Design a protein around this ligand. Structure first.
Ligand SMILES: *[C@@H]1O[C@H](CO)[C@@H](O[C@@H]2O[C@H](CO)[C@@H](O[C@@H]3O[C@H](CO)[C@@H](O)[C@H](O)[C@@H]3O)[C@H](O)[C@H]2NC(C)=O)[C@H](O)[C@H]1NC(C)=O
Ligand SMILES: *[C@@H]1O[C@H](CO)[C@@H](O[C@@H]2O[C@H](CO)[C@@H](O[C@@H]3O[C@H](CO)[C@@H](O)[C@H](O)[C@@H]3O)[C@H](O)[C@H]2NC(C)=O)[C@H](O)[C@H]1NC(C)=O
Ligand SMILES: *[C@@H]1O[C@H](CO)[C@@H](O[C@@H]2O[C@H](CO)[C@@H](O[C@@H]3O[C@H](CO)[C@@H](O)[C@H](O)[C@@H]3O)[C@H](O)[C@H]2NC(C)=O)[C@H](O)[C@H]1NC(C)=O
Ligand SMILES: *[C@@H]1O[C@H](CO)[C@@H](O[C@@H]2O[C@H](CO)[C@@H](O)[C@H](O)[C@H]2NC(C)=O)[C@H](O)[C@H]1NC(C)=O
Ligand SMILES: *[C@@H]1O[C@H](CO)[C@@H](O[C@@H]2O[C@H](CO)[C@@H](O)[C@H](O)[C@H]2NC(C)=O)[C@H](O)[C@H]1NC(C)=O
Ligand SMILES: *[C@@H]1O[C@H](CO)[C@@H](O[C@@H]2O[C@H](CO)[C@@H](O)[C@H](O)[C@H]2NC(C)=O)[C@H](O)[C@H]1NC(C)=O
Ligand SMILES: *[C@@H]1O[C@H](CO)[C@@H](O)[C@H](O)[C@H]1NC(C)=O
Ligand SMILES: *[C@@H]1O[C@H](CO)[C@@H](O)[C@H](O)[C@H]1NC(C)=O
Ligand SMILES: *[C@@H]1O[C@H](CO)[C@@H](O)[C@H](O)[C@H]1NC(C)=O
Ligand SMILES: *[C@@H]1O[C@H](CO)[C@@H](O)[C@H](O)[C@H]1NC(C)=O
Ligand SMILES: *[C@@H]1O[C@H](CO)[C@@H](O)[C@H](O)[C@H]1NC(C)=O
Ligand SMILES: *[C@@H]1O[C@H](CO)[C@@H](O)[C@H](O)[C@H]1NC(C)=O
Lengths: 560, 560, 560
């Protein structure tokens, strides 16, 4: 099948997903009162409120012989020139040398400028502009999001707006927080919106909020208030979890969680709050579902479900258990002492608790050791190729990059293969011997959209920048993934296209039945006379670690 | 033990091995009619036909003050001058400025040139040449291979010959395909071959084929026709496979396959073809072998073996099964409804099928999750060090590099440690402060062969190019693997050799009993006065990610 | 919790830890007699003798317009000027032009110089010096270590001293080995030590040894002799090990060992030496502990413990076992042949041994396959980030680097977060457009210690060199780990600090519930006019593999 191509834009940081790090596993099993049981960890219900905002700004530039800046759009212009007439004021106000100054579009007098779409293809971020000195008025319907505090919201651009999205002068608004004074905010009633693409005007009115930042103006529809919801959300249904008591604090460890939770040895009184009814059915029902799936025929339930507030804000709805084999030991000792309630007999018999502590202790330590093995390997992989790691973790193709020690993540735009065309030659005509490293591509986001240039990335990815150039060599032979197959190139010229089934795939880790042959180093004779480099394929880790050494030597030759 | 050294040449791409990529694992178990069973996936019997070909070409060059090219050897020269007299014509024909031109050897008149071996050590690719203007006639007995279509064959050099290896004017040849006209091909009958190493005219004649390409001439013995064989070959014996029905198509998943197969819900009528007897014994016998190994005491066979043609060309000889615990559920419900044949009772009871769908669903999803986890880690490792990844996958030391999105593979020549000698110093006398990074070595492929220079690579690998230079520091202390031990160097000078047992080994992932001590930086005093860089060992990933940053800054200083 | 920071100094190589490499797993199970049993592998008791030595040297330099070298401190100066008066001789003797020459401190006459601590903060390696021409007398109480041979000891600087630490003229000394003549060594009796920090002086005298090297003088207290101890030390308690006989040699394989051991098919007569009692209690007791933990209810002991001397110096105290299911097969055949002693019945019935050979064979091969998969991934990770890999392997934060094919290991100095202060801006004032890549930090090892400059590393690591510069862009937004949270920077200026819980954590490998949004590329307009690079975050693997390509192209433009 012809897989769809993807054009991943660089994330701006609106969504920064941090990723876990290794732990200090115990050298020997020291935690006392070890036990096994089911658990349903609940995360703080952040309640992400997503809405579509609208930014307004004007890019000012100077063409002398140098100075370029961005300015916001005043409220009267948004509500009258843009909202009603669908045009932008030619002039704009900015600051130069700490002095306010007025700007004129292409040294022309004040006139109205019509806003037109930035791209013909349909996109979530519609976008508009007046120009393709220069004062380009820009309007963009970017996305936005808020969280449980609802005190601030982040736009798609990544900049944070220090004001509640529900803020407003109407009743029931989030007036409790606003970092900007009244002169920088305004709310309009009976506001009618009109899409600049169609210009048909809204059918009914809806109050709209407006905010002016030092660099741009923002606006968004004002919803009254999202009704309250349960403060806890099921994060992960732990199929197997072990509780360990050490240092006056419980320690919950599991195989699929990759993290140890610490509590205070006391159950949270969930019955004293309304959450006892919300989580009372979300956790208890899940507990029985997990128990009836694999523990009904091998374990026995011990006591009622226990809720613990772990460090970091997580709530664990633990359910202690014990294997049937261990149950026989407890009942036998109970009969011996009697010469049944496992909730009380648990941990009472020290001679019975000591062996299980080591048995479960090794398992807990084993998980910690292997988890650290995967975490460190996974962490290094993130720094290597965050796109592949981010895509597999989120379950879908996604764009990502390292913003220091945290990962910024943002969805990619899929484009059908019918609109992607690979150029017949990757040789650059403006620089002999310095042609591109990957095939060039020309595509369009949609059938009616224009043809935008680009470059072929890794795993059907499309890059908007054709900057992947290299001192291109002689004897070049490379295969690049293109759709549901590969595009073969030779001597930096398109040779032909082949399907995915035309190449021997080593699918299983071990496949030693390869019909190999001793390759002969048939290199062109120009390598000995013209002294031009020969093809070496994608650089090896030791090669990049070696090429940079030559670079340092080259710099040394210059410093000398 | 003194392990053998290896000299891995760069593969030319004759054998390209694409490698699996991650999948879209289901978020929840949605596939219906889940079941467990044995399976023997069959790949199309490509039938690789390997034979030794022989290339003939002449390297033409000009000595003005510039122009070099390769030309083929005409047929009359191969069959008369080279085959009988064992000599090459001094003159050759090429093309310049779109005009055919003749070339003379060292501006001398036409004469006969004897072909001599290119190397003394016995190698599979024997090779011969006349010279060590200049017209060097070359003859090489490179390897070749063909596949199922038999319409083309690839030489060891990597270039493809668009003609069937069995092609010829004789009866029973593969005349159905040939991309070259009759003027470029010729077949000789009663041809006698004589090895230029011994001039031993053949004792028994064998017809020989000949082809002339735009760059070189090829020749090879013509075999009549390889007899037909079974069209399917056992690719992998799946010890545990799960079949899932979804979207009107089955889905076969396993733990060791790392790939999901899709079919058309209908068994291929294998009994209608001769393959029913070939696979009827190769698959059925393997099915019983796997079942009698681990499933005889815990599972029961359900129905006869089922053959399905999966997407991509694979044929899966599935054998549905079910655990004995699940069998009790089916028979119990059968007796309830009756108030036996599991092939008909399977999937009939929805209440019994629902829990197993979730049970096996997690297992299927678990395999997909971990497989994707390993695939990306493995794929990232391939781009890091394909030699180690290619060697472990194929089960033997192997050369490899990435030709874009596909990996080229070729064997390595093993050389005994007795013939490898490490130089007593890595300091370069032609460049102060810029000495090599790894030890230099001098070796010979054969005991009687000449001593060829080289450099020490990673894991006893021998590199023919001594280009691993770096700005060499002071206070250098490094260990390099050499044979069955290590070669210790100090201040870029050979210090001594130590065995593998002379260094503390971390054989178990976790080994915290290391007798460490707080190292003190006893850097030489010349670092503060001479300002020379101090030893830093092999560059850390963050260091290579930091050193390049300095390069751009250095370039910025130049662009200023 | 606010984790502690760490300042990791570069290891000098005093402790080198080689790490296992991939193996040649069998293609099919060929080993005969595969059995399953417990084992306790013993390593040679290296007996690391750690002691604190003391180096004495003087750094000589010339201030003309160039010549610098290090010289040792004579014995009379150490025992009289430094030991008694606590001062160093201003003059020193060095070699120049192959001629001994005298050096004076700052072209002054002969005078006494007082030794003062190098750092006010308390450290294990105290250190002292006279100066902060120039003759700086230095005294450092570095660490040292010796091993089983006790013929040589290595200092914290990594330099080896070819003399036994127990060497001396007194009775019971290790006079059997000394690579330095009498003129380079001296032992003082009744020596009184006085700490230069407090000129306290000794109350109880202790003999002190002294040795002079070509570059420095060493001294250390002479202990009579460490009494002998058991020659074997428990290295790893194997919970599951399989023995396989092949090629006239046993082959031991396990899951957690990652290495196959080869023996000579004959048990070592441990009862003939005293080790039969030391290991007789250490191995047998451990064997019963492992057996009583998991194998008591499923396996049966076969024969007495067997000790084998494996290749590499390891001793394996194997204990053959067999599952109860296999026991029934043996006893059943025994009864059939009778028409019990498992030690003699084992391997006697070939028909019973053949199936178990394949069963255990796949398990042994499976471990070898997965172990090789992890080894290469782990080895490739070591070359990427040895610090993270070294820390997890040793169980604690540790400094490490690659000294070629071996890894150097050393500890790190922990510093509390209270003494670490992050600078409010990472912008370099001496180089516009080339500001640092990571936040700068100022800290002190202790409260009373001085404030030393530094840079923030990865995972709370503190680097002493502020050389992590890069061409700093615009639109920069990065998060760096700092203590128990993150430090957010924008436009290379300190914005604010946030806790670890303020960022969404992807803890479980699969977390697809991310409240993602399509980020919009809001880039400053100066990118189009000033042509200044935009923020790209930490370089991707494909980016470093691409940025370096531009470097070669840039050099090609210089070479042109
Ligand atoms: C486990 O129990 C301990 C002890 O009760 C908890 O620590 C306590 O946490 C409370 C808040 O829940 C802290 O109160 C606050 O502290 C500071 C002043 O220290 C101030 O911001 C507020 O006015 C308020 O009083 C309290 O100080 C703290 N006590 C101690 C001794 O640490 C801890 O949170 C519990 N942990 C879990 C995971 O439940
Ligand atoms: C599952 O069944 C479907 C439907 O029968 C199979 O798709 C069909 O595959 C045949 C070849 O086996 C296609 O016929 C060929 O198609 C093209 C024109 O479309 C042309 O090259 C030939 O003249 C020939 O007719 C057929 O079009 C195609 N039908 C559809 C609807 O896709 C499919 O291959 C089966 N898959 C498996 C894994 O068995
Ligand atoms: C397995 O058995 C073989 C054969 O007995 C052992 O090899 C032998 O090892 C001894 C030392 O234990 C070698 O003796 C020494 O050899 C050299 C001269 O070759 C010299 O240094 C000494 O004078 C001494 O004689 C002996 O040569 C060697 N024999 C052979 C045939 O290689 C082997 O060590 C045993 N392996 C294990 C793991 O126990
Ligand atoms: C392990 O659990 C036992 C049983 O719950 C704990 O012993 C009890 O501790 C409570 C206080 O936590 C006392 O009131 C009881 O008298 C103790 N005994 C019994 C029989 O309940 C024990 O403290 C736990 N061990 C550790 C190390 O935390
Ligand atoms: C799961 O398997 C059942 C049983 O084979 C399928 O239901 C039968 O489908 C056949 C045609 O394939 C019909 O003739 C039968 O009447 C169906 N019912 C029974 C009781 O046999 C069912 O379609 C499969 N489920 C899915 C989702 O594909
Ligand atoms: C597997 O073990 C059996 C039993 O120890 C070995 O068979 C014995 O071999 C010895 C010599 O090594 C003979 O003296 C005995 O007569 C053999 N039989 C018995 C019952 O002890 C057998 O050699 C081993 N197999 C392999 C392949 O090493
Ligand atoms: C759980 O086990 C009980 C006791 O054997 C049994 O009655 C019940 O049906 C089982 N439930 C499931 C869902 O298997
Ligand atoms: C190819 O596979 C077959 C089994 O299908 C096996 O017997 C043979 O050894 C394999 N070839 C190689 C070279 O490993
Ligand atoms: C398989 O199981 C059957 C039924 O118990 C038994 O008769 C037969 O011997 C078993 N075969 C093997 C190879 O274990
Ligand atoms: C060394 O190993 C022993 C067991 O053999 C253990 O008790 C000890 O703690 C270990 N030492 C260190 C420093 O980890
Ligand atoms: C080991 O098993 C035996 C036999 O069932 C039993 O008597 C003994 O108590 C068990 N020992 C332990 C420590 O579980
Ligand atoms: C978020 O999690 C809920 C269950 O808590 C699930 O129903 C929903 O599909 C998840 N969202 C996504 C986008 O996967």
């Amino acid at each position: 099948t012809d897989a769809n191509f993807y054009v991943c834009p660089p994330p701006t940081g609106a969504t920064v997903v941090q990723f876990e790090q290794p732990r200090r596993c115990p050298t020997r099993p020291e935690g006392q009162n070890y036990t096994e049981g089911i658990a349903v960890v609940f995360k703080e219900n952040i309640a992400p409120y997503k809405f579509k905002a609208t930014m307004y700004y004007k890019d000012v530039t100077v063409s002398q012989v140098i100075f370029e800046d961005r300015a916001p759009v005043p409220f009267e212009e948004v509500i009258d020139k843009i909202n009603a007439k669908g045009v932008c004021r030619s002039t704009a106000k900015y600051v130069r040398n700490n002095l306010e100054t007025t700007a004129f579009h292409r040294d022309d007098h004040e006139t109205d400028m019509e806003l037109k779409p930035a791209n013909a293809c349909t996109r979530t971020s519609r976008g508009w502009h007046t120009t393709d000195t220069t004062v380009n008025c820009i309007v963009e319907e970017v996305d936005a999001r808020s969280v449980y505090p609802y005190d601030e919201f982040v736009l798609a651009t990544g900049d944070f707006v220090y004001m509640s999205p529900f803020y407003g002068y109407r009743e029931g608004s989030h007036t409790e927080h606003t970092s900007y004074a009244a002169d920088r905010f305004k709310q309009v009633d009976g506001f009618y919106a009109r899409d600049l693409t169609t210009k048909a005007r809204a059918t009914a009115p809806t109050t709209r909020n407006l905010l002016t930042t030092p660099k741009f103006t923002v606006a968004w529809d004002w919803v009254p208030k999202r009704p309250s919801v349960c403060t806890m959300t099921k994060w992960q249904e732990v199929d197997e979890m072990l509780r360990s008591e050490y240092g006056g604090s419980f320690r919950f460890s599991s195989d699929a969680i990759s993290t140890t939770f610490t509590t205070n040895l006391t159950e949270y009184p969930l019955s004293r709050v309304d959450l006892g009814d919300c989580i009372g059915k979300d956790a208890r029902d899940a507990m029985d579902r997990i128990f009836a799936r694999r523990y009904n025929a091998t374990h026995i339930k011990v006591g009622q479900p226990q809720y613990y507030l772990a460090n970091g804000g997580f709530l664990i709805a633990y359910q202690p258990l014990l294997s049937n084999t261990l149950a026989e030991l407890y009942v036998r000792e109970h009969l011996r002492e009697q010469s049944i309630e496992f909730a009380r007999l648990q941990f009472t018999y020290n001679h019975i608790q000591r062996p299980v502590n080591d048995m479960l202790g090794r398992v807990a330590i084993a998980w910690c050791e292997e988890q650290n093995h995967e975490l460190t390997l996974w962490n290094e992989a993130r720094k290597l190729n965050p796109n592949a790691i981010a895509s597999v973790t989120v379950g879908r193709r996604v764009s990502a990059r390292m913003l220091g020690d945290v990962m910024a993540v943002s969805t990619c735009v899929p484009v059908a293969a019918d609109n992607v065309i690979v150029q017949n030659s990757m040789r650059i005509s403006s620089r002999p011997g310095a042609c591109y490293s990957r095939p060039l591509v020309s595509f369009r986001y949609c059938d009616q959209g224009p043809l935008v240039e680009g470059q072929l990335g890794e795993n059907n990815e499309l890059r908007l920048t054709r900057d992947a150039i290299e001192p291109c060599t002689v004897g070049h032979r490379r295969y690049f993934t293109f759709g549901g197959g590969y595009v073969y190139f030779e001597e930096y010229a398109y040779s032909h296209q082949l399907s995915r089934a035309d190449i021997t795939t080593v699918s299983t880790f071990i496949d030693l039945n390869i019909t190999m042959l001793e390759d002969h180093e048939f290199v062109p004779l120009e390598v000995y006379t013209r002294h031009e480099i020969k093809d070496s394929g994608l650089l090896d880790y030791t090669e990049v670690q070696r090429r940079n050494q030559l670079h340092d030597l080259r710099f040394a030759d210059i410093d000398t």
